[PDB]
């Protein structure tokens, strides 16, 4: 509350550390469905159904330009990419499997870097 704060957790390396995680997600062999925005002209239904499209290149640009206020808003966008994927793709598809795999890969790196 006013003049009552928990001890100050050091957040000075968060930017650099999120950048490293995102590099690792970008270079994963199963990243290919997620590297670029879904083409809303060429994929029927996507625009209407997925209210908030997100992809790795859009996260990279937001990160590099100071549009994440803290590490939690970064994680929310990464999770949005996988939540979108699950909304549009059957589990038993190459893309649906890719999204599950990448979500796991991310959540481990997230815990090991910060928790």
Numbering used by the authors: 1856 to 1970
Can you provide the manuscript's text about this entry?
Using an averaged ground-state map for subtraction, as opposed to a single ground-state map, reduces experimental noise in the ground-state estimate and thereby also in the event map. In contrast, PanDDA directly eliminates the thousands of strong electron density blobs with no statistical significance, objectively identifying only regions that are unique to each data set; the ground-state data sets are provided by the many hit-free crystals.
In this work, we show that unencumbered views of the changed, non-ground state can be obtained by recasting the problem as a multi-data set, 3D background-correction problem, which allows the relevant signal to be extracted from conventional single-data set density. Our new method—Pan-Dataset Density Analysis (PanDDA)—comprises: the characterization of a set of related crystallographic data sets of the same crystal form; the identification of (binding) events; and the subtraction of ground state density to reveal clear density for events.
